[PDB]
Design a protein around this ligand. Structure first.
Ligand SMILES: Cc1cc2nc3c(=O)[nH]c(=O)nc-3n(C[C@H](O)[C@H](O)[C@H](O)COP(=O)(O)OP(=O)(O)OC[C@H]3O[C@@H](n4cnc5c(N)ncnc54)[C@H](O)[C@@H]3O)c2cc1C
Ligand SMILES: Cc1cc2nc3c(=O)[nH]c(=O)nc-3n(C[C@H](O)[C@H](O)[C@H](O)COP(=O)(O)OP(=O)(O)OC[C@H]3O[C@@H](n4cnc5c(N)ncnc54)[C@H](O)[C@@H]3O)c2cc1C
Ligand SMILES: [Zn+2]
Ligand SMILES: [Zn+2]
Lengths: 230, 230
């Protein structure tokens, strides 16, 4: 039996470092005989906005619009916007979901945040109860491949940006673990733009090299302790 | 003299607790005689995607598109998209910037993240020489008024979601403090949808009552210690 992988890619330039890290992941996982799918958000012109346009049926409460309530109802009625269900198909089938993106304000670019806001709706990604360890997407693995402008030193506890794990909290714990995902150690390619042609090559290579044994990896303990120590 | 306030509002329903919190802020601050501008992102159908459309005219390098470089250059060249420059005018003129938004995946809704990604460009909000305490928007006050689905106990250090100060990090420190903003204590209205009408009123009331003395407030020490330490 093989493995299915969904790569949610968020970058505008194919020739970029992120483009390379995404292409390299495609190459390597393809080479492994893995089933690979790529959601090139910018090319898809993915709708980041959570609006009533995401529902197609009779709103549960057309007097007072509540996105969460409405999307959960739409999901259960199969009346969500198609672009959302398409993504949910990709995720539903994936064994691993990789997010390739540059760090935008200690987080993911808006287009990617929209992906998370709209795709990971109630009923599909989680239920109440049914989150964190009980997340509907339990059994799946998720990994953040992040490129940064700041340096590794800047992202240390005593660095000006604080520990790199600090900003991973909302994405890894708040979003992924909440949905049931098991989180693999993040792949951070620090300050590519500052790096030399050689160092860049090494960063790209290291990612491919790591993917060779990605199926053997254990997930990180997605806890407050892992992120903040104490 | 006088105090200018820019409220960046991100919610789809006017009749919502979020709308009420925004309306109350408008009321109170307008009553105080302050200058108030509101950016109703959803009504404005604000563009969250960071693309090459954000630059008008000839790109510094159309062969390889680099958002950060292109925008920064376009800023100095006065070639940015009007929707971005409009918001920058409001920001530049404001003394206090209030962000009113529901918590979406331990962060801000994508439409609001988009505002931050595109509006707070290099050359305007920050630049290599100036960031954090030296940010280009140094002197202004910033406040995050967020509503949560989770209860106050869930947002404790040993709670499922962890301490609320953990998710605040990328927002307050990574974004706001980075741009030079003085950060005022965040206003967090825990689980409004779960609260009673009495509790909700108490919530909206404390917010307005707080607004009565906002100008006398001391900004919090936006440090790693403040968010994670003891
Ligand atoms: C709105 C915004 C917010 C930001 N917020 C932050 C923040 O909070 N924190 C932070 O640290 N940074 C931040 N930055 C910076 C951002 O994280 C970096 O600019 C980004 O990660 C750089 O990645 P890139 O793929 O765009 O790089 P590139 O500019 O592509 O840099 C890579 C260089 O390598 C070349 N290259 C590409 N592929 C390869 C390859 N395979 N081998 C060799 N060379 C190659 C490229 O052509 C280029 O010369 C922000 C920037 C913006 C626009
Ligand atoms: C994509 C997505 C991701 C999410 N991620 C998170 C997350 O990470 N963490 C988390 O905890 N939650 C999350 N939520 C949930 C969300 O944060 C909350 O449900 C939301 O903040 C509730 O605020 P509201 O203003 O929309 O509430 P409302 O639906 O408006 O609830 C307020 C209630 O008070 C009534 N009301 C309005 N005005 C007043 C007034 N003045 N006085 C009295 N009553 C009034 C309203 O009509 C309603 O009955 C997420 C939701 C979505 C859709
Ligand atoms: Zn976790
Ligand atoms: Zn800070």
């Amino acid at each position: 039996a093989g493995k299915k992988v969904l790569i949610v890619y968020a970058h505008q330039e194919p020739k970029s470092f992120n483009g390379s890290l995404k292409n390299v992941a495609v190459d390597e996982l393809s080479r492994q005989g893995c089933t690979v799918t790529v959601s090139d958000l910018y090319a898809m012109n993915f709708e980041p906005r959570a609006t009533d346009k995401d529902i197609t049926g009779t709103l549960s409460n057309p007097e007072v619009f509540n996105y969460g309530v409405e999307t959960h109802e739409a999901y259960k009625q199969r009346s969500l916007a198609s672009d959302i269900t398409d993504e949910q198909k990709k995720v539903r089938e994936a064994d691993l979901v990789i997010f390739q993106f540059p760090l935008y304000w200690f987080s993911v670019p808006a287009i990617l945040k929209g992906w998370m806001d709209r795709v990971l709706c109630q009923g599909f990604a989680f239920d109440i109860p049914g989150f964190y360890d009980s997340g509907l997407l339990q059994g799946k693995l998720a990994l953040l491949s992040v490129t940064t402008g700041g340096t590794a030193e800047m992202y240390t506890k005593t660095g000006v940006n604080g520990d790199s794990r600090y900003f991973l909290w909302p994405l890894q714990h708040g979003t992924l673990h909440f949905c049931g995902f098991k989180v693999l150690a993040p792949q951070i390619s620090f300050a590519p733009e500052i790096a030399s042609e050689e160092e860049r090559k090494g960063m790209v290579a290291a990612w491919s090299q790591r993917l060779q044994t990605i199926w053997k990896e254990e997930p990180i303990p997605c806890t407050a302790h892992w992120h903040f120590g104490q």
